[PDB]
Design a protein around this ligand. Sequence first.
Ligand SMILES: Nc1ncnc2c1ncn2[C@@H]1O[C@H](COP(=O)(O)OP(=O)(O)OP(=O)(O)O)[C@@H](O)[C@H]1O
Ligand SMILES: [Mg+2]
Length: 239
Amino acid sequence: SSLKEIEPNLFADEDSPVHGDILEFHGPEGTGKTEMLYHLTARCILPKSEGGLEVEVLFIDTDYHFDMLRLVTILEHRLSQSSEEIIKYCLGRFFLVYCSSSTHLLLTLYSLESMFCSHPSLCLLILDSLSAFYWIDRVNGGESVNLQESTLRKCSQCLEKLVNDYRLVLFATTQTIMQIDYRPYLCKAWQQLVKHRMFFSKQDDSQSSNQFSLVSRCLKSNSLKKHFFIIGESGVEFC
DNA sequence: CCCCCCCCTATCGAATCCGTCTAAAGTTA
Ligand SMILES: Nc1ncnc2c1ncn2[C@@H]1O[C@H](COP(=O)(O)OP(=O)(O)OP(=O)(O)O)[C@@H](O)[C@H]1O
Ligand SMILES: [Mg+2]
């Protein structure tokens, strides 16, 4: 479970067997966060023979924007030899969970622990749009700051406990609402829990309609990394 | 920190010539 093999391109020099890492994605609409997650799942789900890793992955769906036809098309167009049996065998490992509210999210977080401890093979976790319910619970609590964000703080505590308990690697998805620009609006604790930021940007022109820019910083070094990549029907490819 | 629009005005400035018609009246050995 070394970070050099996971993504040597985005992660320049952070290679070590990870005891736990938190990654989050930030970007406006239609930039490619979901496509990047699809590429990561494709590279993490295939058999070891076809450049895969053969390790478990769990996907929490909150935006309700997960598309399975796109995922199966990406997996079919990624590998070399394609068949129904092998694709079924590969997709027998993907895990998907649905949520509807912050309280329901916390209940699902707590409930997952049974299967989670029953499976030591689980090593990678995916969460998307943890700020989907930001406005709802910000308005429910009124002016009382403590009244709002409280369930989100409890959820962050539970996630941190799990990830530092059973050595997970986590990728998160955020949203751009207000205003290298960045204006945080979540709880302070989860802001501290982050390790790197993946700022997502998109170029307007049709020539660069497939090329996008990524900026990453390290909390302990404040070093900037730039990356250009091209999207495709077969998945995501780099420059 | 959040999300959407407004409106007409005012006159100026002169040029360029053509084309002819109609005859009448005798005088002094
Ligand atoms: N087959 C394809 N070939 C090339 N580009 C594609 C293909 N399918 C989708 N795309 C591109 O992928 C881009 C990313 O779309 P997507 O909805 O996954 O973005 P996202 O930023 O992850 O999502 P969101 O806007 O919901 O935050 C789209 O702008 C689209 O142009
Ligand atoms: Mg998306």
